Design a protein around this ligand. Structure first.
Ligand SMILES: Nc1ncnc2c1ncn2[C@@H]1O[C@H](COP(=O)(O)OP(=O)(O)O)[C@@H](O)[C@H]1O
Ligand SMILES: [Mg+2]
Lengths: 577, 60, 462, 124
């Protein structure tokens, strides 16, 4: 096709000469072992192929063969219950071929081929299919996995093979031309799958965390940025989101985060149960894994592959979450291969176009109505690891301008084990306004009122923390030490959640409504009873709020009757003071 | 008595404004359709000579 | 019609073009890939040997064999007409509203010119903006450029939409000149989330207050050079309308922080040295270039008011973006987290927020003759309401004087009857009326900033 | 209601201009088989020469290879015949890395905004 020879090797950057006329971003095959690579910066004869495996033992003179295609995923049925890496190579197949190490140069297919799927046809012959009309259905572990017409394909279907047992190569629908439409299709990772019309966020993403569903919500077509210092509960939070939220599929894109926190994901998701139906939880996660010692140019490819697989499961009417941890490792991969272009870098060392990349990645979210007519939605939760542990970087303050739902962690709440360590004082969420219709018609009628009262009590507490650390929690007025102690009991009951306890891991929103109604019934009638004139020692030793402190550990079956009786005792233990 | 007369006048004036909005609504649909006809009628009588103008500019 | 083929050296956002010298500096080019797709580029660094083109969009399909460039519109311009007041545009000037494109009367260069400093007068009238704590305590005169220093998660775009569909001149409050001026909102959002873009399309076309406005919008995923060119477009359209057709025009520049980040990441493309804290050194001049193109003109009958809304980066006032903005503009108004999440909308707070030109925009026949004294009085009364409300935590309700508890009740009810506006179209007479209803809870005589004429006339009524 | 009225008016305005542009396009694409076009091609041919002095090659429609032969040898240039370039010519100048293009369709696509303002004035 196009032959060239290697002019220069340095690290993961191979300058290959003689390639007069390849395009940018076309995958090269570098060296006799067939290393995957990617063209940037071509000037006349040369081209600048970065490589996705470690060059060692590659030498100059060795050939370089281009392809002409940009980086293409193979989409189709066969990606659920899956672990891949940054260029969509299945790691169970790599373990079957190699030993326990990942030898470079391997060719494996992105979807297995001998597995006989079970075609059910949909369209009669003679129809004029547009790009995105569905063709047939395949049962793929309890999901009626559709098979689209690929985008930008138009015609009239001549033949359809009947309701049988087939394979993913075999062309099921041939158009009038002879342009045939097999099950899989490739798609470039750098183009968003062109959608019909993008709807507005008006429906929540029920996480399971309490604070991340009551104080700081994510809508359905929303984005959410979780930055934090090292050792602050990012990945336990994101495994909780993958484990308990209401998404149809979850795309976990490990990008630079370590090995064991995807090893254990492969070990403990096959025993879990989906909260939506009875399927095993590993039958709804696509899992792209680029660990750190896996090569340091593949990180860009891993995040773009994960987001375009999520966009494919958006087109099929599902509802996808994408949990991309350590986006700043993708920023570091761009810095490292922007250190061999020897260009002039921006602030901090990063390349200039970093905010252009983060915008072009976070703008594939949003609930859409698709090409097929059915609607879907990708939501994206992206973690950010700052270098200093300081949200004043070119990563975090480029990613906090294009997202709602910013969940700023801190170290001081995670030094003592108060988990999750959401710094309440600097987090926000832009979906509180435009979701209150759903809250009213599905949780309770007075939910905005109760939530805003929780918000203003926490604000009043964090306004009085100034005085209480400048003077001391004695020599105060007794009508605000109740404010500080109700802030203390809301931080020890409503916000603080241990993921490893058998209950209180998951918490649907009627339980959070119950706990907030308990806490504010207590505060309302307690400020009543202190304007009658009582102690404040006499409030902080009632036998009515050990009930409150245990009232996050009852299950979601006992919680109605338990709620009625705790509410009764709170209403009945204040006239006796 | 006062709140009953309040909501009675409320519902009556709801329906009155509904009739107002629907009347001016259909009036302006017919208005825009009549004006679309009134302009596309004017389109035809100066077509070929304007095409000769643009053809004489493009082919100079 | 003149392709310069024969290009070498693509590199990220920069492609070089050999043997070209008719490329004017700062020209716009169609880059045609060999498979029939067109992109935009801006010519920089045109020399004898070659000419650099910073490509607008991404560079993916380009090559060296089949890739041509060609010149269009050799200095950056837009086609302006008077009939663009129901439209949206994509930063460049192409519509995204589906209506067929305009018939351009004039063709103006999007880089402006500085006004002649003898040819302007001072701003002397006012505007109402619906917001009570803007209309009363820091007035927007016609010619002023006051920025809204938002936070990060605060509503700034909601106050943008509210001022956009609620601003109105009040010539009836004047000595009754003509209504021959209409009003025009030029609304330029740069770097938005696209959720907010859905918010702006529905919150403009909802109330039918799109018909006196023009929306230059661009998303975040649109390329960075449109986020450079957008306020040039909006201020030259507004400058056209207000000095050629006599409209009082309000220009709302959304999210100047997104602009300055794009200016940094386009300064670092063509390889110039960033100066202080990563920003280019000429940020003061380039930013004053799009602030100081507003203001009244001697003899003509127009005025260009300008509201730059900007997020603070890490909510401090020592960053280059709000530091230079407050170092160019006319005062500032400032939102606050505290009011916002003890639950208040719009969450302007009137303690740290001032206007320079208010003393020229109120008074005898301007809005109402007692205005400035009520402004100073509300400022001092809420000033000694806040800290007495903070002191009462450690002394007690029943261990103060009596007028100080009147101040505490005044401040606590003030920040939910005066600032907690909601969404009603609050006029200037209604807002001064509620300001006197709030001042009535203070005792007469303690109002030590107003003479007894306006006291005996207005005070007393709750 | 007034804004919908203005929408309908500007819609009608734009579609009348689309009618004008379409009939100009049809007159242009009906030019090259009506008895004028070997007088059409010479003007834009020599102007494609004079817009880039020092040419080496021209290439255009091979239907009038005679009128591009015996009226361009005095122009002193290669002529090579490649169709698909309707109504015009293009001139490849020196060192093979510049190509001036010249077509009435291209001139329409370059001049239609200015002529659209002018036609809207002289029409409404
Ligand atoms: N929700 C939680 N409840 C209890 N402990 C937690 C929770 N989240 C995190 N932790 C503790 O903090 C540690 C953080 O792990 P990890 O998220 O990998 O660190 P990082 O936040 O740096 O990614 C966990 O191993 C766990 O011990
Ligand atoms: Mg992690």
């Amino acid at each position: 096709m196009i032959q060239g020879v290697i002019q220069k090797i340095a690290g993961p950057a191979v300058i290959a000469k003689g390639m007069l006329g390849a395009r940018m971003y076309d995958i090269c095959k570098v060296g006799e072992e067939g290393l995957v690579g990617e063209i940037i910066r071509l000037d006349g004869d040369t081209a600048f192929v970065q490589v996705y495996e470690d060059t060692s033992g590659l030498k100059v003179g060795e050939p370089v063969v281009s392809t002409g295609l940009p980086l293409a995923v193979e989409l189709g049925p066969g990606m659920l219950n899956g672990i891949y890496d940054g260029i969509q190579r299945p790691l169970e197949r790599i373990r079957e071929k190699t030993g326990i190490y990942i030898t470079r140069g391997v060719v494996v297919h992105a979807l297995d081929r001998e597995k006989k799927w079970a075609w059910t046809p949909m369209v009669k012959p003679g129809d004029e299919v547009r790009g995105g009309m569905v063709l047939g259905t395949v049962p793929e572990f309890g999901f009626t996995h559709k098979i689209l017409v690929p985008p930008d394909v138009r015609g009239r279907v001549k033949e359809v093979k009947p309701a049988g047992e087939y394979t993913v190569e075999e062309p099921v629908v041939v158009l009038e031309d002879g342009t045939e439409l097999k099950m899989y299709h490739t798609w470039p990772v750098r183009r968003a799958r062109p959608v019909q019309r993008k709807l507005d966020p008006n429906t929540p993403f029920l996480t399971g965390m309490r604070i991340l569903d009551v104080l700081f919500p994510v809508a359905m077509g929303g984005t959410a940025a979780i930055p934090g210092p090292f050792g602050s509960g990012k990945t336990v939070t994101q495994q909780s989101l993958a484990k308990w939220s209401n998404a149809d599929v979850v795309v976990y894109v490990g990008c630079g985060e370590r090995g064991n926190e995807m090893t254990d994901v492969l070990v403990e998701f096959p025993e879990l149960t989906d909260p939506k139906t009875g399927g095993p939880l590993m039958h709804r996660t696509v899992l792209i894994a680029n660990t750190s010692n896996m090569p340091v140019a593949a990180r860009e490819a891993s995040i773009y592959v994960g987001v375009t697989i999520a966009e494919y499961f958006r087109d099929q009417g599902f509802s996808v979450a994408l949990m991309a941890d350590s986006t700043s490792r993708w920023a570091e991969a761009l810095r490292e291969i922007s250190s061999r272009l020897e260009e002039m870098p921006a602030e901090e060392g990063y390349p200039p176009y970093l905010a252009a990349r983060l915008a072009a990645f976070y703008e594939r979210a949003g609930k859409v109505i698709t090409l097929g007519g059915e609607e879907g939605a990708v939501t994206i939760v992206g973690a950010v690891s700052p270098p200093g542990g300081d949200m004043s970087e070119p990563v975090t303050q480029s990613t906090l301008r294009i997202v709602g739902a910013f969940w700023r962690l801190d170290a001081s709440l995670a030094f003592r084990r108060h988990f999750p360590a959401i710094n309440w004082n600097g987090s926000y969420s832009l979906f509180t306004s435009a979701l209150d219709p759903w809250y009213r018609e599905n949780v309770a009628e007075d939910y905005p009122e109760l939530r805003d009262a929780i918000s203003e009590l926490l604000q009043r507490e964090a306004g009085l923390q100034e005085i209480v650390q400048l003077v001391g929690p004695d020599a105060l007025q007794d009508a605000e030490r109740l404010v500080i102690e109700v802030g203390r009991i809301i931080r020890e009951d409503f916000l603080q959640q241990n993921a490893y306890h058998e209950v209180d891991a998951y918490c649907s929103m009627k339980k959070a409504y119950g706990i907030m109604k308990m806490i504010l019934a207590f505060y309302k009638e307690a400020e009543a009873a202190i304007k009658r004139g009582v102690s404040i020692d006499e409030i902080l030793q009632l036998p009515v709020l050990e009930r409150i402190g245990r009232a996050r550990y009852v299950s979601e079956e006992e919680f109605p009757a338990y709620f009625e009786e705790a509410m009764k005792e709170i209403q009945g233990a204040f006239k006796a003071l | 008595e006062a709140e009953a007369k309040a909501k009675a006048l409320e519902a009556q004036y709801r329906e009155r404004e509904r009739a107002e909005t629907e009347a001016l609504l259909a009036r302006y649909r017919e208005r825009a359709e009549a004006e679309a006809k009134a302009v596309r009628e004017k389109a035809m009588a100066r077509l070929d000579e304007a095409v000769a103008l643009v053809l004489k500019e493009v082919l100079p | 019609k003149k392709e310069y083929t024969g290009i070498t050296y693509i590199s990220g956002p920069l492609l070089f073009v050999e043997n070209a010298k008719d490329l004017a500096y700062g020209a716009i080019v169609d880059i045609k890939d060999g498979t029939g797709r067109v992109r935009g580029g801006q010519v920089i660094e045109v020399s004898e040997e070659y000419a650099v083109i910073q490509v607008f969009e991404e560079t993916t399909g380009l090559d060296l064999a089949t890739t041509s460039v060609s010149l269009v519109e050799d200095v950056a311009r837009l086609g302006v007409s008077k009939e663009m007041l129901g439209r949206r545009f994509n930063g460049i000037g192409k519509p995204i509203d589906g209506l067929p494109p305009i018939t351009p009367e004039k063709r103006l260069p999007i880089t402006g010119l500085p006004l002649n400093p003898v040819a302007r007068r001072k701003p002397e009238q006012f505007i109402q903006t619906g917001i009570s704590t803007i209309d009363v305590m820091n007035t927007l005169v016609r010619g002023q450029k006051l920025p809204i220093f938002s936070g990060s998660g605060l509503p700034a775009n909601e106050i943008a939409a509210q001022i956009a569909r609620q601003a109105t001149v009040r010539p009836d409050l004047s000595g009754e000149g003509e209504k021959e001026e209409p009003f025009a909102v030029v609304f330029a959002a740069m770097g938005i989330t696209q959720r907010e873009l859905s918010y702006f399309i529905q919150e403009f076309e909802r109330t039918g207050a799109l018909s006196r406005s023009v929306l230059f919008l661009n998303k975040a995923d649109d390329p960075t050079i449109e986020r450079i060119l957008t306020p040039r477009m909006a201020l030259t359209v507004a400058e056209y309308l207000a000095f050629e057709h006599d409209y009082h025009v309000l220009v709302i520049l959304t999210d100047m922080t997104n602009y300055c980040e794009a200016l940094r990441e386009i300064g670092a493309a063509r390889e110039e040295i960033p100066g202080r804290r990563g920003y280019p050194g000429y940020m003061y001049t380039d930013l004053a270039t799009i602030y100081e193109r507003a203001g009244v003109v001697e003899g003509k009958k127009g005025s260009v008011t300008q509201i730059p809304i900007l997020s603070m980066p890490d909510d401090d006032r020592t960053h280059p973006i709000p530091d230079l903005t407050g170092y160019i503009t006319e005062g500032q108004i400032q939102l606050s987290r505290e009011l916002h999440r003890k639950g208040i909308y719009p969450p302007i707070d009137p303690l740290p927020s001032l206007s320079r030109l208010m003393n020229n925009g109120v008074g005898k026949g301007k809005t109402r003759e007692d205005h400035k004294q009520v402004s100073d009085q509300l400022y001092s009364a809420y000033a000694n309401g806040v800290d007495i409300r903070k002191l009462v935590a450690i002394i007690g309700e029943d261990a103060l004087t009596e007028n100080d508890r009147r101040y505490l009740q005044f401040a606590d009810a003030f920040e939910r009857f005066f600032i907690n506006q909601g969404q009603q179209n609050r006029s200037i007479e209604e807002s001064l009326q509620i300001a006197w209803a709030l001042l009535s809870m203070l005792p007469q005589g303690e109002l030590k900033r107003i003479s007894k004429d306006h006291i005996g006339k207005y005070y007393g009524q709750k | 209601g007034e804004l919908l009225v203005a929408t309908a008016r500007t819609q009608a305005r734009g579609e009348v201009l689309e009618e004008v542009r379409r009939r100009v396009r049809e007159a242009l694409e009906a030019l090259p088989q009506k008895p004028e076009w070997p007088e059409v091609v010479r003007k834009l041919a020599l102007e494609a020469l004079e817009a880039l002095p020092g040419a080496k090659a021209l290439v255009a429609n091979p239907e009038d290879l005679p009128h591009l032969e015996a009226l361009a040898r005095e122009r002193g240039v290669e002529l090579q015949a490649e169709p698909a370039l309707r109504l015009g010519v293009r001139a490849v100048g020196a060192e093979g890395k510049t190509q001036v293009e010249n077509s009435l369709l291209a001139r329409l696509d370059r001049a239609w905004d200015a002529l659209s303002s002018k036609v809207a004035q002289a029409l409404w």
